[PDB]
């Protein structure tokens, strides 16, 4: 979160928190009412955000679901959508934490080692998160879509 | 003269509580007087009746279903023609006081129960009991209690108005009279059916022997051991709940005491005791480095005193004064509060806390080595190479017997 790494920043520097750090912990907690509303929208829209998320993913990447693709059959396609439910969950954590620190140490650190070791095309799962982003930002206003989309594209950046 | 008069002399004219009962453990807990008012509500007659049944029966279950001989002796008191002294005499003549504390009791257990029930204290010396032994055997039990409550003891310290209570009287005429007191009135839980063991010897809890401990302490001059006066104890019931830095409450006895733990603990409490005797000779003069210049920095600083508020203008600024008693000596709030923080920061007190903390850990560890032959040990320590030898062949200490067969 912004609270924990604004601390560990000033922790390492042998000092307390500046006004630049304490006027933002202050500014973040007054932002906390609006963050829970945004995460509350994505919380009980996972049925559509995931299922329509895998909608565009297969239309854009039919190789991964075609015979020979990693997510082929009734089995892998279920797990094919399971990971999108994971990453959609971590974005709800990042929105409430005000940072990608929850998304950092979960689903991002060493993610290329996992998916390379699973045979999954890491570029394909990046395409899946982008398809979820258009569904997510279509569910919110412009002021919110600059945030909810904002955490997806960070996940897109670290996932390639 | 800190205490002007004891509790055995009556309270003279000018106090509501006696002088020893003010600063003793009288005021803390429930061992107080609940003296009857003149005319009273039958609820308030039940309050003074319930304290009598607690006191003279000693937390015994009186079994309110029967109260067989009780309700004649109650109804003499509820009218008002029986005194509280005459109620507590009449309860000590009934059958339900006899079948508890006389039909199975030794004449040491009976006399030590009448001191707890009727009076407050314990029996002090040996010939104090030997009067009440010879008064029972020549006059009988009905003329024992009549000759027991009508001496000079009961009519001064309770009168004929108040119930008896445990007399935390401050001045104890042997010092063991406080020790046998707290060993008899054993805490808020234990009754005298339990303490004399009348239930466990009983045939289905009935008609058992009321045997006694502490008979060796009334014959010879021998104190009570400290575990009976600190664990199952009325001082835990009238406990001040302080922050007492040597905590007087004894720890429960540990399973698996080792001799390796004791033999370094006895060397540690000899280390602190030899270091306390060195550091206490250097106290209060040579430990104060600012003391040597107080004769001069007290006369260097007696120049240009300021009587109103305002001066020491110092070239034309304000820089005023405080002019109190404290800040004319320059002291602050951190200068009288430095006495409260004198447990960690002191040196002589630094030793005497850990002396009594580790002796109190010693006196329950050494007393837990009263269990020898089948006791399962353990090794909680890492089995290091430190080990004292078993060299106990010949005489090493040998306490001096100069009369070996002197005849």
């Amino acid at each position: 979160s912004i609270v924990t790494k604004s601390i560990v920043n000033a922790d390492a520097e042998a000092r307390y928190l500046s006004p630049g750090e304490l006027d933002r912990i202050k500014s973040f907690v007054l932002s906390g009412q609006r963050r829970l509303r945004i995460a509350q929208t994505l919380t009980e829209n996972r049925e559509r955000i995931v299922k329509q998320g895998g909608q565009q993913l297969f239309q854009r990447r039919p190789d991964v679901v075609s015979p020979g693709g990693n997510a082929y059959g009734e089995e892998m396609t279920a797990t094919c959508l399971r990971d999108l439910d994971y990453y959609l969950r971590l974005v709800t954590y990042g929105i409430i934490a005000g940072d990608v620190t929850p998304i950092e140490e979960i689903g991002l650190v060493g993610v290329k080692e996992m998916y390379s070791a699973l045979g999954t095309p890491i570029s394909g799962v990046a395409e899946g998160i982008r398809c979820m982003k258009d569904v997510a930002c279509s569910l919110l206003s412009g002021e919110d879509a600059a945030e909810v989309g904002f955490y997806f594209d960070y996940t897109l950046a670290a996932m390639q | 003269k800190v205490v002007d008069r004891l509790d055995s002399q009556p309270s003279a004219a000018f106090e509501q509580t006696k002088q020893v009962y003010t600063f003793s453990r009288y005021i803390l807990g429930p061992h107080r007087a609940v003296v009857a008012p003149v005319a009273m509500d039958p609820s308030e007659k039940e309050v003074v009746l319930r304290a009598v049944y607690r006191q003279v029966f000693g937390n015994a279950y009186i079994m309110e279903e029967e109260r067989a001989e009780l309700r004649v002796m109650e109804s003499q008191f509820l009218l008002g023609e029986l005194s509280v002294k005459e109620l507590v005499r009449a309860l000590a003549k009934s059958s339900t006081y006899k079948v508890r504390f006389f039909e199975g009791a030794v004449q040491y257990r009976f006399i030590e129960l009448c001191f707890k029930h009727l009076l407050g204290r314990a029996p002090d010396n040996h010939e104090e009991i030997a009067v009440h032994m010879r008064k029972y055997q020549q006059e009988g039990y009905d003329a024992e209690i009549d000759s027991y409550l009508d001496a000079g003891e009961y009519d001064n310290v309770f009168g004929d108005d108040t119930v008896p209570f445990l007399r935390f009287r401050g001045v104890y005429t042997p010092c063991d009279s406080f020790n046998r007191q707290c060993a008899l009135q054993g805490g808020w839980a234990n009754s005298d059916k339990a303490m004399g063991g009348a239930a466990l010897s009983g045939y289905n809890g009935s008609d058992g022997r009321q045997m006694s401990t502490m008979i060796g302490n009334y014959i010879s001059g021998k104190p009570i051991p400290y575990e009976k006066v600190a664990a199952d104890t009325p001082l835990k019931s009238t406990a001040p709940n302080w922050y007492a830095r040597p905590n007087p409450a004894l720890a429960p006895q540990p399973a698996y005491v080792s001799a390796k733990e004791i033999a370094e603990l006895r060397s540690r409490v000899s280390k602190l005791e030899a270091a306390w005797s060195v550091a206490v000779k250097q106290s209060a003069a040579a430990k104060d480095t600012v003391e040597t210049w107080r004769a001069a920095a007290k006369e260097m600083a007696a120049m240009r005193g300021i009587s109103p508020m305002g001066e020491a203008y110092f070239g034309g600024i304000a820089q005023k004064v405080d002019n109190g008693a404290l800040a004319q000596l320059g002291n602050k709030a951190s200068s009288y509060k430095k006495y409260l923080y004198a447990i960690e920061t002191d040196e002589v007190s630094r030793l005497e806390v850990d002396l009594e903390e580790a002796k109190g850990q010693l006196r329950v560890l050494e007393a837990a080595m009263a269990k020898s032959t089948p006791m399962t040990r353990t090794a909680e320590f890492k089995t290091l190479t430190k080990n004292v030898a078993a060299v106990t062949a010949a005489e090493k200490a040998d306490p001096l017997s100069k009369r070996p067969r002197i005849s």
């Binding site: - | 004219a13 005319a39 509500d41």
Partner: protein, 177 residues
């Protein structure tokens, strides 16, 4: 002992009536001035040991025969016991003013008191005066018209409670007369 609520119940128990709305308007006025009664007992016990020394030594300068040799306040033992029974009585009025009923005063303190002072050789008519000095100080402290200490109060009326404590002090005066 009774209070202001257990007086009307045992008054209603003699007629076996339920305590209904004909009697409950008099008790809901007692909890209406419940804040003023707690503000009146607090004004007396905050000034308690200085009320009695105002009164016991006020009795001496009005009748100097008590500190004459062979009197009844001549010895330090007798003067300190006279301060003792001055503040026993002022305690027992402040139980009765706190309960709003005199049935703690008349049976724990006043019962047998006149028969005690005749047996002790305590003169009765001077102890009327030491109580009657405290009656002036109890109505002064409750009305906040004490001339050298004003206590902080929310402003309003206490001529009922000043008259109520004055009815409890001449219960003490009528008992030992």
């Amino acid at each position: 002992m009774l209070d202001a609520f257990s007086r009307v119940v045992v008054n209603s128990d003699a007629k076996a009536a339920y305590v209904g709305g004909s009697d409950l308007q008099a008790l809901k006025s007692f909890i209406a001035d419940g804040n003023k009664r707690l503000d009146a007992v607090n004004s007396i016990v905050s000034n308690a040991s200085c009320m009695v020394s105002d009164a016991v030594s006020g009795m001496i300068c009005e009748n100097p025969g008590l500190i004459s040799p062979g009197g009844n306040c001549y010895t330090n033992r007798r003067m300190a016991a006279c301060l003792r029974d001055g503040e026993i009585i002022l305690r027992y009025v402040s139980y009765a003013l706190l309960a709003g009923d005199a049935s703690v005063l008349e049976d724990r303190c006043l019962n047998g008191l006149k028969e005690t002072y005749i047996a002790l050789g305590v003169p009765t008519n001077s102890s009327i005066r030491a109580v009657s000095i405290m009656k002036a100080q109890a109505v002064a402290f409750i009305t906040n018209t004490a001339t050298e200490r004003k206590m902080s109060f929310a402003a309003g009326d206490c001529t009922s409670l000043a008259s109520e404590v004055a009815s409890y002090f001449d219960r003490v005066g009528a008992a030992i007369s």
